[PDB]
Amino acid sequence: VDLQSLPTRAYLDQTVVPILLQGMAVLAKERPPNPIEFLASYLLKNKAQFED
Amino acid sequence: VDLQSLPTRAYLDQTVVPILLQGMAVLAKERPPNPIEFLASYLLKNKAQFE
Numbered sequence: 445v446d447l448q449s450l451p452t453r454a455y456l457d458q459t460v461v462p463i464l465l466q467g468m469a470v471l472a473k474e475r476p477p478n479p480i481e482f483l484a485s486y487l488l489k490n491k492a493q494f495e496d
Numbered sequence: 497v498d499l500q501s502l503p504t505r506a507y508l509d510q511t512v513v514p515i516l517l518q519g520m521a522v523l524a525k526e527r528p529p530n531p532i533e534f535l536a537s538y539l540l541k542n543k544a545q546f547e
Binding site: 447448452455456459460463464468471472475479480481483484485487488491494496 | 499504507508511512516520523524530531532535536537539540543546
């Protein structure tokens with residue numbers, strides 16, 4: 445806000461970096477056979493915590 | 497190759513960081529209405545490139 449005006453790094457910081465940090469924490473704990481898929485599912489499941 | 501020998505940071509670097517860098521670059525160019533959904537969809541659509 446305004447997200448469209450932010451430099452690249454800041455835009456990513458204010459949209460996806462926090463949920464990615466948490467998703468990667470959980471990925472690193474669980475070490476699943478399908479890490480990319482696992483992470484994608486994690487993002488969809490947990491988006492409300494990070495404002496989606 | 498042997499992912500089991502890779503600690504947390506190496507493991508993440510080998511498995512998800514490359515596609516994340518690529519997907520985040522696309523996300524930052526598109527700046528779509530739902531960034532989290534966009535990125536999750538990107539991962540599924542493009543994970544085949546990362547074997």
